[PDB]
């Protein structure tokens, strides 16, 4: 078998995911009225609306070697030159030194030229341009997303558009939010699209919107707003959650959520809203399902469920429970007082509540300490390799990088293994003494498509930039992941390919049956007579920490 390759692009920042941090676990339990039970937490339905938008812009530069900037394209040029004929006007207008100025392509004359598809781009992010003073016209199709407020929508490039995607004039959408002058927007009725790759023209009309931002022109199809779905969505069904009362506020804790919620001790009147049919129905249905799964044989329900609004925008549904052993103590004590109703009886017998408070207290503290141990370790690995940590946290291969203290994320494009080829050598002939640290690769996004140049990354990743170069060494030997198996390289030359099952695996935590042997270092004689560094494998943490120390010494020498 062979795994699919991935060409992960660099995220621009359209999607930023903050990540949780450690907490202050109490040294000794202090919460009152401890109790276990089932819970279902609901998150605010952000209602993400995704759509594709076309971006237009031009580039202008001076041939003397200066003054390079970007500017948008007017509306008439997009709907007449580009839409009707797929061509861009040669002349371009811009502001230079706070003064109106113009330019032309090679200063030839006022003419028109057709647009051509981008050389590499992506199959899902098609783009076009007029050329691979100088003027260039560029048109690109990118994705866009909007949230419940629908006041702004972010493009795939990371730039926000302060305007509602549903704004228009066809269906009285003038009331929609907008932050641009009336002269900066235009809507066309009966508009027909034209795929520049084929120029076959659209088959049916689609009203098109057009906006001109200070840096580019954006256009998207105006679609009526869909009916609003339920305002809340099930975030996660908690199998077990402990509730504690302290400081006039409840405290909910779990082992899987890794977060503590706080409420005002008053049940939110869910009945006040007619959405109970969406939340009350889904919530109650989950309580019985979880209860029948494991609590039907050992626990008993205590009254009807409860709903509370927690800090951060979460709605927590609750169903307090108590073990059969604790139930025996309550009924036994109740019989003494008599000389069946668990509600309005729990927390009454202080002597019976004293041991359970301490018992459940250790469980809550244990989860908090364990979660802090995992959170601090997870956060460190996240900074060390956001690609692997981001991919596992979402269940699919994903690209990500840290934009300071927040992590930007984007999706990766997969490519089949039969569409990639690896070069036979990793040495660069342009300059001796330097060679690529990883094998070079050439591939195509799809079968029969154009070939592109790139470099092999980690975990079948395909890098579009060939920059992983390093001073070369003697006795080189490395294994690189390539599809299902591995590709072996020695002395910066392709040797052969081997499968995944041809190498010893240590899947288990501890394996003492490794038939290892005392390796004897064998260095070529050129290391002594020519003083050329010998191979040392990838840099260990101390090696990189020690390697930069030498750089400081070299700088001091200089």
């Amino acid at each position, epitope marked *: 078998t062979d795994a699919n390759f991935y060409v992960c692009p660099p995220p621009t920042g359209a999607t930023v995911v903050q990540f949780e941090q450690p907490r202050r676990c109490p040294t000794r339990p202090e919460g009152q009225n401890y109790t276990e039970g089932i819970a279902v937490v609901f998150k605010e339905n952000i209602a993400p609306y995704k759509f594709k938008a076309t971006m237009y812009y031009k580039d202008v530069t001076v041939s003397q070697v200066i003054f390079e900037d970007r500017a948008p394209v007017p509306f008439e040029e997009v709907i007449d030159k580009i839409n009707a004929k797929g061509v861009c006007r040669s002349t371009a207008k811009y502001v230079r030194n706070n003064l109106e100025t113009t330019a032309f392509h090679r200063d030839d004359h006022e003419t028109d030229m057709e647009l051509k598809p981008a050389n590499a781009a992506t199959r899902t992010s098609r783009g076009w341009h007029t050329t691979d003073t100088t003027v260039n016209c560029i048109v690109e199709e990118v994705d866009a997303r909007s949230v419940y407020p629908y006041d702004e929508f972010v493009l795939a490039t990371g730039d926000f558009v302060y305007m509602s995607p549903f704004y228009g004039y066809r269906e*009285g959408s003038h009331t929609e939010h907008t932050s641009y002058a009336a002269d900066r927007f235009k809507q066309v009725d009966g508009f027909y699209a034209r795929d520049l790759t084929t120029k076959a023209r659209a088959t049916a009309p*689609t009203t098109r919107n057009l906006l001109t931002t200070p840096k580019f022109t954006v256009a998207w199809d105006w*679609v009526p707003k869909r009916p*609003s779905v339920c305002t809340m969505t099930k975030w996660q069904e908690v199998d077990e959650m402990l509730r504690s009362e302290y400081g006039g506020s409840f405290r909910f804790s779990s082992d899987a959520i890794s977060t503590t919620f706080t409420t005002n001790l008053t049940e939110y009147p869910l009945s006040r809203v*007619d959405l109970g049919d969406c939340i009350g129905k889904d919530a109650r249905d989950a309580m019985d399902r979880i209860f029948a799964r494991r609590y039907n044989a050992t626990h008993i329900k205590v009254g009807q469920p409860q709903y509370y609004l927690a800090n951060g925008g979460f709605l927590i549904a609750y169903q307090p429970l108590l073990s059969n052993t604790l139930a025996e103590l309550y009924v036994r004590e109740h019989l003494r007082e008599q000389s069946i109703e668990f509600a309005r009886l729990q927390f009454t017998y202080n002597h019976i509540q004293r041991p359970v408070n301490d018992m459940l207290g250790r469980v809550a503290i244990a989860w908090c300490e364990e979660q802090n141990h995992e959170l601090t370790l997870w956060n460190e690995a996240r900074k060390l390799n956001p690609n692997a940590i981001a991919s596992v946290t979402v269940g699919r291969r994903v690209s990500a990088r840290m934009l300071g203290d927040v992590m930007a994320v984007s999706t990766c494009v997969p490519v089949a293994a039969d569409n990639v080829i690896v070069q036979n050598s990793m040495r660069i002939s342009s300059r001796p003494g330097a060679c690529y640290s990883r094998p070079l690769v050439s591939f195509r996004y799809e079968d029969q498509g154009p070939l592109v140049e790139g470099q092999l990354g980690e975990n079948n990743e395909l890098r579009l930039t060939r920059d992983a170069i390093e001073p070369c060494t003697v006795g080189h030997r490395r294994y690189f992941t390539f599809g299902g198996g591995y590709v072996y390289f020695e002395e910066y030359a392709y040797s052969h390919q081997l499968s995944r099952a041809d190498i010893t695996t240590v899947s288990t935590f501890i394996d003492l049956n490794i038939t290892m042997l005392e390796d004897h270092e064998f260095v070529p004689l050129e290391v002594y007579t020519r003083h050329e560094i010998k191979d040392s494998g990838l840099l260990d943490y101390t090696e990189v920490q020690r390697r930069n120390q030498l750089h400081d010494l070299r700088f001091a020498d200089i």
Partner: antibody
Amino acid sequence: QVQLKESGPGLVAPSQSLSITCTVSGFSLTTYGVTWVRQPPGKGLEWLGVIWGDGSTNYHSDLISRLSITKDNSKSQVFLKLSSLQADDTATYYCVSYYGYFDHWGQGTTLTVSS
Amino acid sequence: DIQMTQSPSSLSASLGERVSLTCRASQDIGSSLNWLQQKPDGTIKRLIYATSSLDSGVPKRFSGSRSGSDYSLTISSLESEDFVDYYCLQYASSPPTFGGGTKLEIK
């Protein structure tokens, strides 16, 4: 300009599966959706479902178990399906586009369920 | 779901008389409300969309407005053809729901 026309059997037996096709022109189905509405004799209108530009669809809670809608973008036709038809299913079915919110409506087809 | 209540179920008026209808929503729907008209043969036509925005080509006599949680439709002068059915419709929350309907008859 936008127009919609329905096409169905007109008469069907109870407990069988219904099939109605609505031909629409004036807008692309790849971007806009189509909604279905019915009206029994002497009663008000009733919403059935809707199919947006994408493959997503929404159905009424009283007909989700039996209602099903599909489409073809090349032919600009939307197919309506309804299984396990009862006696009270006799009603005039209409297909209403989303070029607007409910701007254009079709003529409608009168369907009767009886053996 | 949002339930729409239309009143009156029926109305009596003379030719050229000024009448008005009202439709109330159980929950907030904003400006997302439309008024429809059905011909005797079953043809459905939209009159007002998005709360008081006259439809393309609709007669000027038709109109609409909002008053708090109540939405209304008004006809300046009634003609012999306007004596047909009318229905209020909402589309703010899923699923859209129609009103109870109103029939206009001669006085």
